[PDB]
Amino acid sequence: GSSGSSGDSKDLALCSMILTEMETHEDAWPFLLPVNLKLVPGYKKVIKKPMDFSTIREKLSSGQYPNLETFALDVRLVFDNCETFNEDDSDIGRAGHNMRKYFEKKWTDTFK
């Protein structure tokens, strides 16, 4: 093993970067804002953990993520829920595909 070359905050600091760029994606707004449970017809019911960039951000800086793993778990989940609630046919749906692809090509490069 010995595959880490990371620290405590350093690792986190990066997460903030990737998040930013993605947050400024032409297909990253579907999450930028939280899904109004009152407006949307039963959203929480379908989405176990309705995450969003607006939240993840506050949590990231607040120091909610002890390491990269956690931070990632949330991100990957952000695009996941969408693929579930939304459909590739719907605007949001497609957006999830574009982002997901980026998050990876961006994450792998960041560290990997």
Query: 93 and 59 in contact (C-beta within 8 Å)?
Result: no
Token couple for 24: 């400024």
Instruction: Tell me the technique behind this structure.
Output: NMR
4 half-sphere exposure, CB direction, 13 A CA radius: 10
Q: How many C-beta atoms surround the C-beta of residue 24 within 10 A?
A: 10
- Amino acid of residue 40: V
Q: Which domains are delineated in the chain?
A: 1-112 (1.20.920.10)
